[PDB]
Automatic annotation (TrEMBL), chain A:
Organism: Xenopus laevis (African clawed frog)
Superkingdom in the source lineage: Eukaryota
Stated name of the protein: HAUS augmin like complex subunit 7 S homeolog
Encoding gene per record: haus7.S
Automatic annotation (TrEMBL), chain C:
Covered range of the whole protein: 168 to 222 of 222
Gene name tied to this protein: haus2.L
Coiled-coil zones: 1-25
Name this protein carries in UniProt: HAUS augmin like complex subunit 2 L homeolog
UniProtKB/TrEMBL annotation, chain D:
Species in which this protein is naturally found: Xenopus laevis (African clawed frog)
Record-given protein name: HAUS augmin-like complex subunit 5
Parent sequence residues shown: 206 to 462 of 666
Gene field: haus5.L
From TrEMBL, chain F:
Endpoints of the signal sequence: none
Part of the full-length chain shown: 344 to 398 of 978
Highest taxon above the source species: Eukaryota
Official protein name in the record: HAUS augmin like complex subunit 6 L homeolog
Listed transmembrane segments: none
Amino acid sequence: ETSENIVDVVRERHQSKEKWAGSTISTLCEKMKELRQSYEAFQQSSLQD
Amino acid sequence: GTTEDKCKEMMRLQLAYICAKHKLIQMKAKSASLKVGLQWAENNASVVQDKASQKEENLKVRITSLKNETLQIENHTNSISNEKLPGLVRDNAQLLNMPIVKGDYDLQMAHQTSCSSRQDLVCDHLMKQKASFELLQLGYELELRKHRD
Amino acid sequence: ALMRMESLEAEMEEVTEQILTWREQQKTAFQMNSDANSSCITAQTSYLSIENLHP
Amino acid sequence: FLRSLHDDSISSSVHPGKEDLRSLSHQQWMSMAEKVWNTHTPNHILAALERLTLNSTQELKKLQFSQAADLSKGPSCQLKEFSEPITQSRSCNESTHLDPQETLPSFHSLIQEGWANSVKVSSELRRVQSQAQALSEHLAERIQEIHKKLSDGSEVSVLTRAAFDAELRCVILRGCRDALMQECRMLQEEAAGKKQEMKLLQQQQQNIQEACLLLDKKQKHIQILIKGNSSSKSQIRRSSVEAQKYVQDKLLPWPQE
Amino acid sequence: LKTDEELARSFRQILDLSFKVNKEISLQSQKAVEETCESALVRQWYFDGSLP
Amino acid sequence: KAKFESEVLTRLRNMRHKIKREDLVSIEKIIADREREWERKWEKILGKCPFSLLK
């Protein structure tokens, strides 16, 4: 029972879409990736300085 | 925060944007001017030895002409930089508030619609009640006429 | 499943570090510009002096 | 009938000819009301009104519970798929495609995006500033090279140098002006592109205002009906006392005469 | 189960962090630009057209 | 496995506490000082509140 419950909880977290920031609906993983790309872009723009 | 706090926040956002955008455009203009200057300097570096053979009187006339053209261009540039540019930047800055305002409007409209509906319900109930009272009132009026006969 | 959950936690730590690193880089960048602008005010006055060739 | 009067009062469209129809409707009701009082006993009519009133109260309670439930269900609740296509869902229609009602964004969330965009501009500024400094250094190096080639001490070389500096200044200033114009064009295009959106917001704003007026009108009607119903209740009590007084003062004394 | 809940909370906080950092950087940038420019010019930027 | 996952939970909590009690408090103080310094500076130069002119 426990093994099955744990698999479900993790699956729900990866697939669930919510309004995290702004006007766009996304999964936690997508929004986190977007945020990471944005700060990578910011850092690249600072090293070329 | 109070509508006032939100407004203030929006304004802050605008002011920060104006300051940054103005400087950005100035820097973009400086950069573009330097680029064109550099390109011109590189193209005319070989021709400057051949012009040294020109009559002194022609160079003096040219310098004077160029000085007058420079002053005209400077006055046009300053006019754009000090009068046209700041107004346009400010207009653009105000547009930053569009999504926020829209969002608020949407929120208000939604609220209103909800309220209107609630009001309609209240009105309907009160009218139903009135309808019942008026029926009874008419009943009493009718009853008095038969007593008179 | 537990491995996937652990991966999310690692990613969160990484993004948090990236935001804080970026914040520090900007703090240094504004301190260096304030020190350079103090030095450069001196040099720019020099070159526009070539307009003074009167006698 | 009352509702129709209400809707009209709210919609300000006094179509000329509606009065004949109102009178007729009013007469129709009067006839019906009269018929009701001729056909049934007052005792049964009042009993019927009591029941209608209970029903009306129960409907209001149900509506209270249903609206409370709609406020507490803020969205975690999962779309349960329940199955039979039984109810038509036609209601007064059919209608409800809309519920995209994704949680409208909060001020906080929008303003957060705004500041993120502001940082994008500041980041671009830094980039262009670094580029302008490199170009300025490169130009200074080239001017120095050209000045070294014209240093043959001859009056003509000095004048040629001055002419160069003057031509260069003109080219740089033309470049700055063209660039600024270009940027102004961009800013105008951007503002022009958003002009439609702003019109739309203006319309919305008008709509919101109009709607606020409408809500106020409705609110006034509600206040009128409240007063109206309170008055009607007092009148019903008065009217009842008048009929009883007539029977006691004018009819009951006749058998003795 | 507790770890799953903490993941969502922790991420909202990270978003708040990002926001406040962006605002900080934007205000610092504003200050840097204002210090390089004469107050009269900047006044024209912010307010020119609104002053009688 | 229970011990390891417990450690992951503690790491996430420590991270969130560090962000909320250390990092955001410091950043919010800097933002508030900067907003006040700015409002004072322009209030002095304009003789009125700067935001009234933008309304």
